[PDB]
Design a protein around this ligand. Sequence first.
Ligand SMILES: CCCCCCO[C@@H]1O[C@H](CO)[C@@H](O)[C@H](O)[C@H]1O
Ligand SMILES: CCCCCCO[C@@H]1O[C@H](CO)[C@@H](O)[C@H](O)[C@H]1O
Lengths: 49, 441, 423, 43, 61, 99
Amino acid sequence: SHTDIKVPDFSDYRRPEVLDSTKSSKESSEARKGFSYLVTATTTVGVAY
Amino acid sequence: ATYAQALQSVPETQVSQLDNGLRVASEQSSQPTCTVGVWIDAGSRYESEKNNGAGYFVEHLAFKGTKNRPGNALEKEVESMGAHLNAYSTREHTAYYIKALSKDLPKAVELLADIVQNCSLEDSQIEKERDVILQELQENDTSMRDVVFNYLHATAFQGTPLAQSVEGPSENVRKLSRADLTEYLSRHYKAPRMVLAAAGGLEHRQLLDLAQKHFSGLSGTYDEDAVPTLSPCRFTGSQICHREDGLPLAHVAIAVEGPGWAHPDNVALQVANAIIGHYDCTYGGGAHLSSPLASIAATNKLCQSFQTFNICYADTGLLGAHFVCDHMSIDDMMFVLQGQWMRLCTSATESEVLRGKNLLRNALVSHLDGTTPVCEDIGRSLLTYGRRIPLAEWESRIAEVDARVVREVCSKYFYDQCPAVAGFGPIEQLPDYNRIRSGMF
Amino acid sequence: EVPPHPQDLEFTRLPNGLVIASLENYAPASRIGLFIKAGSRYENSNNLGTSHLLRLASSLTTKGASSFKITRGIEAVGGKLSVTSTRENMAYTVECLRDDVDILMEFLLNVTTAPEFRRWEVAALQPQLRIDKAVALQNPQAHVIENLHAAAYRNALANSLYCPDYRIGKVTPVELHDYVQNHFTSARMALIGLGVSHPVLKQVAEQFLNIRGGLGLSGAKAKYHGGEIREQNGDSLVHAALVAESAAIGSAEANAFSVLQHVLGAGPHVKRGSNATSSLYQAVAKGVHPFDVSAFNASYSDSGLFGFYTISQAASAGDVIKAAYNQVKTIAQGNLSNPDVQAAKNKLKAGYLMSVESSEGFLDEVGSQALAAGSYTPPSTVLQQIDAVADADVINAAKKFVSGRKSMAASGNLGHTPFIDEL
Amino acid sequence: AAVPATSESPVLSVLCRESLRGQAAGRPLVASVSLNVPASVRY
Amino acid sequence: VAPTLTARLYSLLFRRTSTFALTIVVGALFFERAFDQGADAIYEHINEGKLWKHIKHKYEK
Amino acid sequence: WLEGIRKWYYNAAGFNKLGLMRDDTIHENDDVKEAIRRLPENLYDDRVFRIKRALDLSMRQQILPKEQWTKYEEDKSYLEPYLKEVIRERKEREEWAKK
Ligand SMILES: CCCCCCO[C@@H]1O[C@H](CO)[C@@H](O)[C@H](O)[C@H]1O
Ligand SMILES: CCCCCCO[C@@H]1O[C@H](CO)[C@@H](O)[C@H](O)[C@H]1O
C-alpha cells in the first residue's frame, strides 16, 4: 500500500529551529530567509564593488 | 427580492447542549425529508503510529450490528423505512448520518444513538473487515489522485500526526485488535467531542428531546489524563517524487502552508483560488476561459486537468493545486501555475478579484443545496468554528475583499515561501525543488 | 428556526404551447432551465450524433453574443451554463446569484434560439466529440446501457447519447441548424425556474421565447424488437443487463414496475451494507461468494425497459445472471409477501422525495413533467399513486418481464456469459 | 461556476463487494456537458 | 514580543525586489568608502614612513 | 468622377494584368491569416490558383492577354465579410482585457 510510505527522518539535517514537530516553523521562517538574503545582498555588493 | 434580502431570510441555526456536553444543532425548513447525523472530533490526526487506521476500521464496523440490533438487523431497519445510512472519516473529523423522511426522525436519532454507543465489534466481523480494508488499500493504490494527496500530507506534515493517512499502513490493518479499537473509541467518542446535527422538516425542540432521550448516557467526562488534545503540526517545505514511467499520466500536487480553519484569511484565499480556478478536458469554455491558467492549458493542451485547493486543519493547512498531465507538460504547467500565484501577489486587478468574489458567492450558496449539505455544514461548523456562520456573515467577509486584500493575503502565504511537493508517475520532467522554490518569487 | 413561503409552484402556458413554471424559494441564487424534446431519439439514420454535438456546442457564437462573450460574460458573475440530455429531452440550465438572472437569461436565449453554427467553429469543435465520448465510455455501465437500448429497439430510443465514431468530423452546420429548427419549438419547450419570481420569468418568455414551430417534428414511435449485443473486451469483471419491454412513463403499469424495482433492489441504502432487504442481491449472495446486482428500470414516453443489471467476475457471470433471473421468476409465480411490497413502497416514496430535495432534482422533475404530461403532479399525489399499487400489479409486472421477449447487453470476458436463449 | 465536479476527467479499480456495491446501473442514462464543470454521465 | 535580527532585515529590505536592490545599491556606496579607506589605512600602517605621502612634507607647496 | 480616377488607378496598379483580384494582394497580418483560414473551400482554392498563376507570370516577367485581365467592374471583395468579423472579435477581446 502507498500508505506504507513514510518520509524518512531528516533530524540530522534540519536546522535547530525546525526540529520540534509540535511547533510551527513559521515563527523562524523570516529569520531563516532573512539570513540567506543578507548573504545574497552582501555578495551582490561585493561583486558590484 | 435582492440577493441581500435572500441572505437575511435564511432560518438561523438553533444550537443547544446536553448535560454531558453533547451539542445539538439544527436548521428547520419545510422539506418532507431530512438528514440527521453525528459529527465527531476524531480522525487520524488523533491516532499514533500504533493505532493509525483505527478510526477507519471502526467506520467499517459501525453499521455491522449493535448490542440491541445484532448483525444485519440495523441494516434491515434502515432499509425498510427507505432511509440511507452513510459515513466518512478524514484526518480530523468523522461523521455518521442518515437521510430519512422527516416523519421518521425519532427512529433515525435512535439508530444513530445505538450506532454511536452500542456497536458490537464482533471478533468475526473484525476479521472480515480486515480483508475488506486490505482490498480497499489495493484499490486506492490505483487512484493516482488519492496517492498524490496522501503523499503531499506525508511530506508536508512529516513527523507529525497529520502526515498519517486515514486508512493507516497495511501492517496496522493486519494487527489492530478489538482492544485497540475499543480503546480508540472510549478515548475519542465522548459527548463533548460530538455534535448531533440535523437539517430539514423538523423542529429543534423535537431533536433536542430525542437527544436528551437517546444520548444522555454518552460520557461527558473522560477525566484529565485522557483528553486527546491536538499539538501543532510542523509544516516542512519538501518534496516526494514517486517515479513510475509505467503510468500514462503524471499527477502533481503542490502547496504552501495554509492558516487553519478559524483564520479570517481563508475567505480572501478562497477568492484567489477561485480566480485561478479549475479545469479539465471536458470543459466547454476552452480558450475563452477567464482564468489565464485555464485558457493557456486549454489552448496549448498543457494538462488533462487541474484544481486549486485550500485544505484546512485546526491550526495549519495545505494551500495550492493539483494537476494531471502528459510527461512532457509538467514543467510548462508548473511555470504557468506559479506565474499565476506571483501575478496575484503583486498585480491582482479589481475586476478579476470581483470575478473571484462572485465565483465564491455562487459556490457557497449552491453548495448548501439540500438537507445533507446543510446538515454537514452545521456539524462541521460547530466542530471547527464552534458556531454556524450565517450566509449574511460570509457575504460581509467576501464583500470586504478587494484587489489590495488579495495581493497582501496571497503575498503572505505564497510569496517567497517553501512549498511541499508530491509527484507520482512519469515525472522525469517535474522541476527540481530549487527551481520550484525560485518560482515562489 | 421557522422557515420563510413555502410558496407554491406557479404555472403558465402560453398560446404557442410553451410552458413556464417557477417557484420562488427566496434563495440567494437562482436556477433556470429550458427543457426541450430534442434528445437522441429524434435523430435518424442520416444524422446520428447531431444532438451530441449540439450538446457540446452551447458556447459557440450566436447572433446576439460571441463565443468569447458567452464564456467571459457568464464567468464574470460566477455563473454556470450546462446542457444535459437523455434519450428524449435536452435541458439547458443556467445558475447564478438572483440579481444576475437577466444576464444568464440573455445568453440562454441566444444559445437556444439564435445559434449561428459557424462553419469554422463547428469544424473546430468536432474533436471534442472524441474526447467527451472517451471520457464517458471509461464507465462500463455506459457501454452496456447504450448497447442495451441499441439491442432492444429498432429505432428512436435505439440511438446512442454519444456520436457514432464514423460521424465524428462529419456533423455539418446544416444538420445542426436543421435539428434545432425541427425540435427547438414552442410546443416542445418548457422554461422552468427556481429562486426567481414568476412574473419576471413570464415576461422573459413572453417577449423572447414567443417563437413558433408548434409541436415540431416528432419522431417515429419507438418499436421494441429485442436482441442482444455482446462486447468481448476481456475485463476481469463482466457487466450485463437483461430487460424486457415494460411500460411507458405516465401509465399506472409504470408504477407497478417502479415498485417491483424496489422489491428486487434498486441501489444501496447503507454504506458497505449487505443489502438485507434487496431480493435480487440476497438471491445471488446465497449462490455466490464478489458481485453486484440491481433492478434496472427505464421509462420513456412511448415505451420502457425493465430488468436487472449484474457485475461479476467473468467466470461467475452465468451463475449470477441465472440466480437473479430465477429470483424474478419466483415473484412472477406469486411468491411475494406484503411486508416486502410495503418496504419497497417506502424506499420508492422516500427515494422520490429525496430526489427533489435539491434544486437540480427539483428542476429536472418539474421540467420533465412539463414535457411529458404538460401538467404538474405534486408529491402528495405521487405518493398516493405509489400506495395505490397492488401486490397483484407487482406480480403481474414480474410476469410481463419473464414472458416478454428479452434484450440483453454484456461487456467483459464473456466466456461464461450466457445468451438469452440459455436463460 | 467554481464548484469543480466530484470527479475530474482525464483520458490518454474494484476488488471487493463493498466497493462494487452501487455500480450496477438502475436507471436510463443522462449525459451532461458544461461551460465550467466536468462532463458527467449518470447511471 | 517581536522578531529577531535577520527576520527584520528580511521583512523590511529583502522580501521585495525593489527594496532589496536598493539595499545592495546604497549598501554598495557605503561599503566602498569604508572598505577603501580601511584598506588604505592598513596598507599605509604596514608601510609607515616609506610612502611618498609620509615623507612629502620634508620637500614640499 | 472619383470613379474615373478609380478605374484609372485600378489599371495603373496593374495586379489585374496578372489576373489577381484586389483581395489577393492584401498584406497578410494575423487578422488576414485567420480570415483566409475561414474561407469556404472554393474561394480558398480559387485564391490559391490566382496567386500561383500570378507568381508564375511574375517569374516570367509576363502578363495575361488583355481579355483575361481582372475587370475593375467585376472585382468584388470575397474576403471582407470574413476579415470584418475577425477584427470585430479581436476588438471585443481587447475591450474585455481592458476591464
Ligand atoms: C489574439 C489571439 C487570441 C485567440 C483568438 C480566438 O478568438 C476567438 O475565436 C472564436 C472562434 O474560434 C470566436 O468564436 C470568438 O468570438 C473569438 O474571440
Ligand atoms: C501618377 C500620376 C497621376 C496623374 C493622373 C492620371 O489621370 C489619368 O490619365 C490617363 C492618361 O491620359 C487618362 O486616360 C485618364 O482618364 C486619367 O484619369
